[PDB]
Amino acid sequence: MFKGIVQGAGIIKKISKNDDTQRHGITFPKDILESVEKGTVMLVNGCSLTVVRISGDVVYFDIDQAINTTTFRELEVGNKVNLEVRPEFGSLLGKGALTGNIKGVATVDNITEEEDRLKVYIKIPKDLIENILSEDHIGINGVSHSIEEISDDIIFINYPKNLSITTNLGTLEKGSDVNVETLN
Numbered sequence: 378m379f380k381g382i383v384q385g386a387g388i389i390k391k392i393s394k395n396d397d398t399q400r401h402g403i404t405f406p407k408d409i410l411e412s413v414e415k416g417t418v419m420l421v422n423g424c425s426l427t428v429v430r431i432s433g434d435v436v437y438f439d440i441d442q443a444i445n446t447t448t449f450r451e452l453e454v455g456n457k458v459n460l461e462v463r464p465e466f467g468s469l470l471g472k473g474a475l476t477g478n479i480k481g482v483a484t485v486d487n488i489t490e491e492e493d494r495l496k497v498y499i500k501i502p503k504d505l506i507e508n509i510l511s512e513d514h515i516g517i518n519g520v521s522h523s524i525e526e527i528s529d530d531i532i533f534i535n536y537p538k539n540l541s542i543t544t545n546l547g548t549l550e551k552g553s554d555v556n557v558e559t560l561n
């Protein structure tokens with residue numbers, strides 16, 4: 378499993394629509410690109426996916442098993458995805474560790490940037506699914522962080538603002554769909 382610390386951003390270059398599957402070609406930054414190969418299983422927006430092909434800096438994935446419980450179906454060419462390759466020589470996670478099994482999609486209710494914090498409010502739909510506890514960490518697009526507060530069906534996560542920079546958290550707006558991994 379994975380730390381839930383995003384190591385870089387990919388940009389979707391190509392999408393093949395195959396109805397109950399899609400193939401996404403993602404441009405990878407050079408440091409992550411050279412750390413992966415065919416058959417690498419890594420997190421893309423917090424979801425475990427297997428590399429099917431690499432051509433130049435474009436890394437390809439098929440989304441099939443994951444197509445009904447993640448955002449991939451509705452993403453577009455040019456969108457930015459979070460990337461995380463498994464730890465090289467191990468880790469103690471303990472433990473916002475992520476497994477890569479996304480529980481389902483949720484939707485950004487509100488964002489506020491203040492006081493060096495990115496405050497994200499995420500509305501949890503009723504049929505997701507189990508948990509969610511304010512003492513626990515949660516994965517949002519592969520970023521693992523403690524929950525700040527839960528009010529009704531809205532979870533408030535108060536991120537340091539520089540994760541606005543190093544992950545796609547800073548592309549989120551009201552109505553953005555996200556992959557949630559509850560923990561657990």
Ligand SMILES: Cc1cc2nc3c(=O)[nH]c(=O)nc-3n(C[C@H](O)[C@H](O)[C@H](O)CO)c2cc1C
Nearest residue numbers: 418425426427439440441442443446477478479
């Ligand atoms: C080893 C492993 C590899 C996986 N590879 C894929 C993949 O390439 N495509 C896919 O749609 N789901 C894949 N999944 C399943 C996916 O992570 C899971 O359906 C979603 O997280 C559910 O929301 C994989 C899961 C595991 C454990």
